[PDB]
């Protein structure tokens, strides 16, 4: 596969052209006054999006050289998204500025490696300054303000997010789902729910809603399948002797056992129900064990210390205040397990969370903890059409990620003033040689880009706005939407520290490396 | 794959061109004086259709940028069709008008998102006004008028639909089927007809029509296959002892039992007949249960509380006044069950219908309810060729959907006056800022489009007609077909509220979102 | 396939063009002030590499004739990289210089073969001079200096490598792996770790970290799978009688023995744990023998002297001070085996090393030796993105290779002065005839190329710098990074002798042979 090689300024110019194209495409979506971007899909309706990463990841150029810069900027945006979940457009603009300055400052005697060293030094100093400047979050109003700002200045989403986290705690489980109505909703699921329905409709006893209901019902857990008639008779004997319903959670119920259950329920009125055990693999056993602790019962069929169903006892069956089972989902509301073991199980789960880190394992552990502790909340966003629902879901997810980040770390002035306030810190550095001085100057000049872009999107001269902000007091910033200088903290225009620092770090790291190239090798295009 | 990017005015112009082409193609079929569109088909005779959604879906543009607008308008039309079943052309024209007005107002200082918010606020106010203006449907005359207007001014369609809904109630089951004669027909099916034929022709006892006819006949319902000769003798013995016919509905009849039945009938004249069970699986079980309840009999072979056929009893067999069985269908006319049991079964059916919604499940539950309660109505449309039959079926389906919507909610003045009468409600709004004022003005100017289009299709000046309508009383409108101003309600020109509000909402929602684009990303055409 | 033939100066010019292109692409990355080269990747992000062999291996030219020279230079670079691991760019530049000089001197009467003979003679003399000038490496500071120089002036890598070699000896096992933090980290592994996890979670006894810890635990080693319950019980009585925990390392634990162990641990609290054996095939058996020797136990199931598990003895069980086992890895820290046998094992392994040499076999034997003697060290390189991590990892690997080469042999002045100091040796040769004199002259003039290139990359006249170096004292060269003449050894600018001599030998060997061509036969391009 023959290859083409270009030397010197030509390759840099072409790469800069590609970077500028992608950055210009992504920059028009920045600020409260930004505008959306339409992407043409290959199978159906186009996407109308306002996310920087989504726009960046859907641009590939014909020329083989510009595509290199496009790919590098895509990597910057994707890394920022993966690390923080927000602040991708800021990363893109910062990377573009750094790349432009680096390409402009090269000369015959310059040493790009030392320039990169100086850039990294300046970035480290700026990040330290940001960490000094931060402040924690304590009030729900701050949470609501962060959520509102991250969601394109929409107040309803912020209020919904604040209510959700208030109800299920700040570090709970929250998810976004497609709605079917015009207006969004918040639904909170409490107790134990595992999305399974009764096997046979004959167990229905409450027609309204086609649901089966009990009160103070014995709970039976069986890890393995229930096949032999001899393996159930003691349980029904106990339930009928103590005049209490019985809910049978087992891997499955065989034809003979199911026939016995249904016939007894029909002809004697004995209150009994059966549901499939939830989860697959080790998750099934884990959930069964957790239910056993929650309801104070015992599980049958464990490989270790196996217990036989033929010798069930009244103390082995857990007690639950309420049980609801329908076509699709089942709910155990009020367990009766002892508190100490519940707390110990919670402690073990949280300890396990820190042991092994994988998205699936971590998510499963968090879901189990939420089920066993406080519950989960579901956000359903509505709209007139699918395009609207998707576009709103993007913003809602951005708001959730930003709010979580603001819970983890403090908050700083929004609107790009957080970076502008760090310029003074760069005047205390002592560059070792000339190249590090060049790098420090590059970072100092680049720190102003975000606020300038936000002002530019509003249709006003950004440079004058920045000049005015720098000379004003410490807490004064520019409110793009209103178009006047206000007290940032009071008005609630705030941003998490994690997002800002991650964006700056990733952008600088990638762009500085890019600016040291001298030769570019590509493949000749095929016919 | 390489991709192309366009900025600002060029993308807007191309997308507007595509939208204009699609809407111009679709809008020539609006109003009573509209003309048809011929769609070329790749496997037979072309379609000659006057339906907006079909024309919208049958258009794809060679260029990529215009295709985006075409696809968005297709989404609008499809959403309106699925939600309401009518009013697709109105939605298309409203979407075009909103898109054009939004594009005409974008400038450097403009803020498209706030314009969208203002548009949504205005649309909500207008829909509230419409719901205020709505009035309920009370008499069959309004049903006939709605059906007639929905079917492009065809009185026979309205009369047929009104008669059908009178016969089978206002919420019965009505289905449209192709015809084989010049004149359309209405057929009512009462009792329980399930389209199953006698297993052996030897049971026929009436030459004319080759139909098996019985009076005051026992019915034997079996969920399991009848094969054993032992299991079938007792029922025949009871029937012979009581000297009454007997119809067997079962999963299937085996060689031995079938041979016994046929030979007994032939050599002794015993009155018997057997048919397959209708439906499959759980549906079959439910159908058998419903017949058992209706006929006052008992079902054998049920998995829960199973009853075996060897111990059949006289009180376990239902009685039906009349039984008709032929090669294609079998009908049970007059059941002999308990009225309270029937009422409870209907209550359960409707309650289940109120639990979970799916087209298949809802359709099946409705079919069972109609069979057990009032029956169904079948409409057969006539024509000289398939093209005419399809073109008329389109209108008949539109009429059914419009009449159903009119039954569900109120009715408002037709001919576009319903929207024209809502303009004053927008004059009571107070925009928060300039952008919301621009959006409100956009909707205020858009609300006149339907009347203007209807007038234009008639060959007169739309603006003059709209102006004259606006200065008249609150009850006067324009009769497009006749060509004079009349009392809209008195002449019977009315439309459902649901159609109007759905069209307005969908069109505004999609168009306003479309009008906030700044960039378009599309794939370069391949080779 | 049709082929094309070229004669004389045409072919030489074409091949020289190809060689010049490749060498120009590769030489811009030489010295402390070099610049990086970007390679376009077919499936993802491009590489940003400052590695000579990587650049050379990724250039192919459309023209058939140039590809010959490109391929020959690729061969030079690959051979140098394989033999030494460093000094690829020096080899490439030397090869270009030799090829150009040889091509320049071919005439009607010249004899290329004799020129090659003279070139080889001069190269041998220069290599002898280098070996005479070398000195051994003694202090850790020299190791740090060599690592820093080879790592492109990065002191952190040098310090890390020096510390690692101090900890795990100067001939231990060091591996480079991708990290997950901003800063590179050094992790040292001691004892014996084979990355195997506990068979069943029930064995966990330390809640924090979900680990299993024992002190002074009996060790049972079984080459073959332990399945029959009778084959594991006697060890259990032994352990429960001596009141010590037992660790069962075997090929696998079947459901029977596994059930016995887990049940006893759960119900009686007996301290036991089991793990799979490491590695496959003969490696597994060798590892088991090594553990047996270290712990002082005996391996069960050996093909020779097959010792059945039914007769375990208190003295046949290994003893280990500490045991840690978790979901992924297990560790035995302080074995109680006899020292003398440990030595005999070590001498046996090292004796086996020298007999057979295959990369897999050498790696495995070295791993076993390190595990049994001193342990291993892991170098984790940090970074913000994949490109940065790869770029740093290249330099780290080059530093490791250079440090190993400098430990194996001596060190010589860096910056190209080592070769410059060897020119006087060539003045003592007496060419047999004219052609050998021409070859000696070619090598004499070529020896200056590395220093000239390094000076050129810094942005100064290379000729003046090399001339001033040659006329100065022996211990004075040019410091490119600072830009002044200094004492090379004192400043710590040194290189290994192996790298220099290998690069010179390979470059001369290939270029001299290339410079004796007269006809080039190439395949005609296809369609
Ligand atoms: N009303 C406002 N006035 C001033 N600055 C604002 C205002 N609202 C948001 N900002 C600032 O603008 C930026 C928010 O824009 P945006 O959400 O597009 O940025 P991003 O996080 O980089 O990208 P995205 O969220 O699309 O991935 C943040 O700097 C936020 O501080
Ligand atoms: N004789 C009439 N005079 C005035 N307006 C009329 C008359 N007949 C129908 N209309 C109005 O014209 C529209 C009916 O046309 P049409 O059926 O093409 O529109 P649509 O409901 O948007 O689409 P579709 O063809 O799918 O039903 C409705 O607004 C109806 O109120
Ligand atoms: N500060 C310095 N001043 C002078 N010479 C230096 C300095 N640092 C390194 N050198 C010399 O420059 C050369 C380093 O270049 P480099 O490591 O790129 O060459 P290479 O070993 O041929 O290639 P590579 O390591 O990429 O495979 C070596 O000769 C080293 O001795």
Cβ neighbours of residue B337 closer than 8 Å, sequence gap 6 or more: B293, B294, B295, B296, B297, B318
Residues of A in contact with C65 (CB under 8 A): none
Report the alpha-carbon distance of residue C29 to residue C457 in Å, rounded: 8
Residues in chain C: 527
Please answer whether residues A497 and A130 qualify as being in contact, where contact means their C-beta atoms are separated by less than 8 angstroms. yes
Question: Do A262 and B303 make contact, defined as CB atoms within 8 angstroms?
Answer: yes
H/E element holding C115? helix C112-133
Residue B368, φ and ψ in degrees, nearest 5: -60, -45
Please answer whether residues B61 and B69 qualify as being in contact, where contact means their C-beta atoms are separated by less than 8 angstroms. no
Report the alpha-carbon distance of residue C343 to residue C22 in Å, rounded: 52
Q: In the 8-state DSSP scheme, what is residue C461?
A: -
Task: Give all strands (DSSP E) within B212-281, no chain letters.
Answer: 212-222, 246-250, 272-276
Q: Is A243 left (phi over 0), alpha (psi -120 to 50) or beta?
A: left
**Nearest Cα residue to atom 22 of ligand 2:** B87
Report the alpha-carbon distance of residue A481 to residue B111 in Å, rounded: 10
Cβ neighbours of residue C94 closer than 8 Å, sequence gap 6 or more: C446, C449, C450, C503, C504, C507, C508, C511
- Beta bridge partners of residue C520, listed in sequence order: C6
Three-class SS of A398-432: HHHHHHHHHHHCCEEECCCHHHHCCHHHHHHCCCC
Q: What technique solved it?
A: cryo-EM
Task: Give all strands (DSSP E) within A372-488, no chain letters.
Answer: 376-381, 411-413, 476-479, 484-487
Q: Is C415 annotated as a binding residue?
A: yes
CB-based pocket (< 6 A), ligand 3 = C 29-32, 34, 51-52, 86-90, 149, 398, 414-416, 454, 479-481, 493, 495
Choose the closest CB to B506 out of A209, A266, A385: A385
Q: Is C88 annotated as a binding residue?
A: yes
Report the alpha-carbon distance of residue C283 to residue B31 in Å, rounded: 86
Query: Residue A331's CB: how many other CB atoms inside 10 A?
Result: 17
Please answer whether residues A26 and A52 qualify as being in contact, where contact means their C-beta atoms are separated by less than 8 angstroms. yes
Cβ neighbours of residue A251 closer than 8 Å, sequence gap 6 or more: A222, A223, A224, A225, A226, A276, A277, A284
Query: Residue C193's CB: how many other CB atoms inside 10 A?
Result: 17
Query: Residue C105's CB: how many other CB atoms inside 10 A?
Result: 16
- Buried-state track A15-25, b at ≥16 Cβ within 10 A, e below 16: bbbbbbbbbeb
Q: Which of C35, C38, C64, C273 to mutate to test the interface with A (most CBs of A within 10 A)?
A: C38
Query: Residue B401's CB: how many other CB atoms inside 10 A?
Result: 19
Please answer whether residues B489 and B475 qualify as being in contact, where contact means their C-beta atoms are separated by less than 8 angstroms. yes
**A406 CA distance to ligand 1 centroid (A)?**
14
Could you tell me the sign of the dihedral formed by the alpha carbons of C147, C150, C152, C157, in that order? negative
Name the residue among B496, B500, B425, B451 with its Cα closest to residue B121.
B425
Report the alpha-carbon distance of residue A527 to residue A160 in Å, rounded: 55
Please answer whether residues A450 and A416 qualify as being in contact, where contact means their C-beta atoms are separated by less than 8 angstroms. yes
**CA distances from residue C335 to B13, C219, C238, C371 in whole angstroms, order as listed:** 81, 10, 20, 12
Please answer whether residues B499 and B88 qualify as being in contact, where contact means their C-beta atoms are separated by less than 8 angstroms. no
Residues of B in contact with A384 (CB under 8 A): 79, 505-506, 509-510
Q: Is B154 annotated as a binding residue?
A: no
The alpha helices in C207-338, defined as continuous H runs, are: 233-242, 255-268, 282-295
Please answer whether residues A480 and A457 qualify as being in contact, where contact means their C-beta atoms are separated by less than 8 angstroms. yes
Please answer whether residues C489 and C475 qualify as being in contact, where contact means their C-beta atoms are separated by less than 8 angstroms. yes
Task: State the Cα torsion B216-B218-B223-B225 to the nearest 10°.
Answer: -120
Please answer whether residues B301 and B222 qualify as being in contact, where contact means their C-beta atoms are separated by less than 8 angstroms. yes
Report the alpha-carbon distance of residue B353 to residue A209 in Å, rounded: 10
CB-based pocket (< 6 A), ligand 1 = A 29-32, 34, 50-52, 86-90, 149, 153, 398, 414-416, 454, 479-481, 493, 495
Choose the closest CB to A385 out of B75, B111, B304: B75
Evaluate: CB of B416 within 6 angstroms of ligand 2: yes
Report the alpha-carbon distance of residue C14 to residue C503 in Å, rounded: 25
The alpha helices in A243-384, defined as continuous H runs, are: 255-268, 282-295, 339-355, 359-373
Report the alpha-carbon distance of residue B257 to residue C297 in Å, rounded: 79
Report the alpha-carbon distance of residue B31 to residue C130 in Å, rounded: 100
Choose the closest CB to A518 out of C35, C259, C383: C35
| Strand A318-325, strand A330-332: pairing | antiparallel
Query: Residue B228's CB: how many other CB atoms inside 10 A?
Result: 13
Choose the closest CB to A207 out of B72, B348, B523: B348
Cβ neighbours of residue C512 closer than 8 Å, sequence gap 6 or more: C98, C102, C115, C116, C119, C120, C439
Residues of A in contact with C48 (CB under 8 A): 513-514, 516-517
Please answer whether residues B258 and B336 qualify as being in contact, where contact means their C-beta atoms are separated by less than 8 angstroms. no
Report the alpha-carbon distance of residue C270 to residue C252 in Å, rounded: 20
Cβ neighbours of residue B186 closer than 8 Å, sequence gap 6 or more: B160, B163, B164, B377, B378, B379, B380
Report the alpha-carbon distance of residue A292 to residue A287 in Å, rounded: 8
Report the alpha-carbon distance of residue A512 to residue A115 in Å, rounded: 8
Report the alpha-carbon distance of residue C194 to residue C174 in Å, rounded: 16
Question: Do C459 and A109 make contact, defined as CB atoms within 8 angstroms?
Answer: yes
Report the alpha-carbon distance of residue C442 to residue B457 in Å, rounded: 94
Name the residue among B68, B59, B66 with its Cα closest to residue B40.
B59
Report the alpha-carbon distance of residue C155 to residue C161 in Å, rounded: 10
Query: Residue B278's CB: how many other CB atoms inside 10 A?
Result: 19
| Strand C272-276, strand C246-250: pairing | parallel
Please answer whether residues C72 and C485 qualify as being in contact, where contact means their C-beta atoms are separated by less than 8 angstroms. no
**C31 CA distance to ligand 3 centroid (A)?**
5
- Beta bridge partners of residue A212, listed in sequence order: A325
Task: Give all strands (DSSP E) within C212-343, no chain letters.
Answer: 212-222, 246-250, 272-276, 299-300, 318-325, 330-332
**CA distances from residue B43 to A331, B47, B56, B378, B394 in whole angstroms, order as listed:** 54, 11, 20, 29, 20
Name the residue among C492, C501, C409, C526 with its Cα closest to residue C135.
C409
Q: Is A428 left (phi over 0), alpha (psi -120 to 50) or beta?
A: alpha
**CA distances from residue A368 to A293, A345, A349 in whole angstroms, order as listed:** 13, 10, 8
Report the alpha-carbon distance of residue C218 to residue C235 in Å, rounded: 10
Name the residue among B268, B223, B267, B210 with its Cα closest to residue B249.
B223
- For the CA of C478, the closest atom of ligand 3 is 4
Please answer whether residues B502 and B80 qualify as being in contact, where contact means their C-beta atoms are separated by less than 8 angstroms. yes
Query: Residue A490's CB: how many other CB atoms inside 10 A?
Result: 8
Report the alpha-carbon distance of residue A196 to residue A183 in Å, rounded: 28
Which ligand lies nearest the alpha carbon of A453?
Answer: 1
Residue C522, φ and ψ in degrees, nearest 5: -130, 150
Please answer whether residues B409 and B134 qualify as being in contact, where contact means their C-beta atoms are separated by less than 8 angstroms. yes
Name the residue among C160, C31, C20, C10 with its Cα closest to residue C452.
C31
Whole-angstrom distance between the N-terminal and C-terminal Cα of chain C?
A: 12
Name the residue among B281, B334, B291 with its Cα closest to residue B299.
B291
CA angle B150, B154, B157 (to 5 degrees): 80
CA–centroid distance for B230 within its chain: 49
Whole-angstrom distance between the N-terminal and C-terminal Cα of chain A?
A: 13
Report the alpha-carbon distance of residue C163 to residue C186 in Å, rounded: 9
CA angle C165, C166, C170 (to 5 degrees): 50
Q: In the 8-state DSSP scheme, what is residue C243?
A: T
Chains A and B touch each other (3 or more Cβ pairs < 8 A): yes
Residues of C in contact with A56 (CB under 8 A): none
Report the alpha-carbon distance of residue B275 to residue B287 in Å, rounded: 14
**CA distances from residue B276 to A472, B225, B251, C354 in whole angstroms, order as listed:** 89, 10, 6, 86
Report the alpha-carbon distance of residue B246 to residue B219 in Å, rounded: 6
Report the alpha-carbon distance of residue C257 to residue B495 in Å, rounded: 80
Could you tell me the sign of the dihedral formed by the alpha carbons of A49, A55, A57, A59, in that order? positive
Report the alpha-carbon distance of residue A499 to residue A401 in Å, rounded: 10
| Strand C299-300, strand A272-276: pairing | unpaired
Chains C and B touch each other (3 or more Cβ pairs < 8 A): no
Report the alpha-carbon distance of residue C246 to residue C257 in Å, rounded: 14
Which ligand lies nearest the alpha carbon of A458?
Answer: 1
Q: In the 8-state DSSP scheme, what is residue B253?
A: B
List the chains bordering chain B where 3 or more Cβ pairs fall under 8 Å. Answer: A
Query: Residue B402's CB: how many other CB atoms inside 10 A?
Result: 24
Task: State the Cα torsion C437-C441-C443-C449 to the nearest 10°.
Answer: -170
Radius of gyration of the CA atoms of chain A, in A: 30
CA–centroid distance for A345 within its chain: 26
Residue A81, φ and ψ in degrees, nearest 5: -60, -45
Please answer whether residues A22 and A56 qualify as being in contact, where contact means their C-beta atoms are separated by less than 8 angstroms. yes
| Strand A318-325, strand A212-222: pairing | antiparallel
Please answer whether residues C104 and C441 qualify as being in contact, where contact means their C-beta atoms are separated by less than 8 angstroms. no
Provide DSSP, C350-381. Answer: HHHHHH---HHHHHHHHHHHHHHHT-EEEEEE
H/E element holding B49? strand B47-49
Cβ neighbours of residue A42 closer than 8 Å, sequence gap 6 or more: B523
Report the alpha-carbon distance of residue A320 to residue A325 in Å, rounded: 13
Report the alpha-carbon distance of residue A448 to residue A478 in Å, rounded: 13
Question: B144: exposed, middle or buried (C-beta count within 10 Å: 0-12, 13-18, 19+)?
Answer: buried
Report the alpha-carbon distance of residue C153 to residue A114 in Å, rounded: 11
Resolution expressed in Å? 3.4
Please answer whether residues C370 and C461 qualify as being in contact, where contact means their C-beta atoms are separated by less than 8 angstroms. no
Please answer whether residues B158 and B142 qualify as being in contact, where contact means their C-beta atoms are separated by less than 8 angstroms. no
The alpha helices in A134-183, defined as continuous H runs, are: 140-150, 155-168
Question: A119: exposed, middle or buried (C-beta count within 10 Å: 0-12, 13-18, 19+)?
Answer: buried
DSSP helix/strand/coil, B336 = coil
The alpha helices in A135-254, defined as continuous H runs, are: 140-150, 155-168, 233-242
Query: Residue B394's CB: how many other CB atoms inside 10 A?
Result: 20
Q: Is C137 left (phi over 0), alpha (psi -120 to 50) or beta?
A: beta
Evaluate: CB of B496 within 6 angstroms of ligand 2: no
């Amino acid at each position: 596969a023959a290859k083409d090689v270009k030397f010197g300024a030509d390759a840099r110019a072409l790469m800069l052209q590609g970077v500028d194209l992608l950055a210009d495409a992504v920059a028009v979506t920045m600020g409260p006054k930004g505008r959306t971007v339409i992407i043409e899909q290959s199978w159906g309706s186009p996407k109308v999006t306002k996310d920087g990463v989504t726009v960046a990841k859907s641009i590939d150029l014909k020329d083989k050289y510009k595509n290199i810069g496009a790919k590098l900027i895509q990597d910057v945006a994707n890394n920022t998204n993966e690390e923080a979940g927000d602040g991708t457009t800021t990363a893109t603009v910062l990377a573009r500025s750094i790349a432009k300055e680096g390409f402009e400052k090269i000369s015959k005697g310059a040493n790009p490696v030392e320039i990169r060293r100086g850039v990294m030094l300046a970035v480290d100093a700026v990040i330290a300054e940001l960490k000094k400047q931060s402040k924690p979050v304590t009030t729900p109003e701050e949470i609501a303000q962060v959520a509102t700002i991250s969601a394109n200045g929409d107040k309803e989403i912020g209020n919904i997010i604040s209510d959700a986290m208030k109800k299920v705690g700040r570090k709970g489980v929250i998810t976004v789902k497609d709605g079917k109505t015009l207006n969004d909703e918040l639904e909170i699921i409490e107790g134990m729910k595992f999305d399974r329905g009764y096997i046979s409709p004959y167990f229905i006893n409450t027609s309204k809603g086609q649901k089966c209901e009990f009160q103070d019902a014995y709970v039976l857990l069986s890890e393995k399948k229930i096949s032999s008639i001899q393996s159930i008779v003691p349980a029904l004997e106990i339930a009928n002797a103590h005049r209490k319903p019985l809910v049978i959670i087992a891997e499955d119920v065989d034809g003979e056992a199911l026939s016995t259950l249904v016939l007894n329920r029909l002809k004697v009125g004995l209150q009994v129900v059966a549901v499939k055990a939830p989860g697959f693999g080790d998750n099934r056993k884990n959930q069964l064990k957790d239910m056993a602790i929650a309801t104070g019962g015992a599980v049958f069929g464990e490989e270790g210390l196996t217990l036989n169903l033929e010798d069930v006892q009244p103390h082995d069956l857990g007690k639950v205040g309420e049980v609801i089972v329908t076509k699709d989902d089942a709910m155990l509301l009020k367990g009766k397990g002892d508190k100490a073991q519940i707390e110990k199980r919670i402690q073990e789960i949280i300890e396990q969370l820190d042991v092994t880190t994988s998205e699936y394992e971590k998510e499963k552990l968090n879901e189990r903890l939420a089920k066993l502790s406080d519950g989960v909340a579901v956000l359903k966003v509505g709209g007139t059409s699918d395009v609207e629902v998707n576009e709103k879901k993007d913003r809602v997810t951005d708001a959730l990620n930003a709010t979580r980040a603001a819970v983890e770390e403090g908050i700083v002035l929004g609107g790009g003033c957080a970076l502008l306030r760090c310029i003074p810190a760069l005047d205390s550095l002592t560059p070792a040689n000339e190249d590090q001085k060049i790098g420090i100057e590059i970072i100092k000049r680049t720190l102003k880009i975000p606020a300038m872009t936000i002002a530019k999107n509003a249709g006003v001269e950004g440079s004058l706005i920045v000049e005015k902000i720098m000379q004003s007091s410490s807490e004064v910033g520019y409110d793009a939407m209103a178009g006047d200088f206000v007290n940032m903290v009071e008005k609630g225009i705030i941003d998490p520290t994690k997002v800002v620092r991650t964006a700056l770090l990733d952008a600088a790291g990638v762009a500085s490396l890019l600016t040291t190239a001298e030769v570019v090798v590509t493949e000749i295009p095929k016919e």
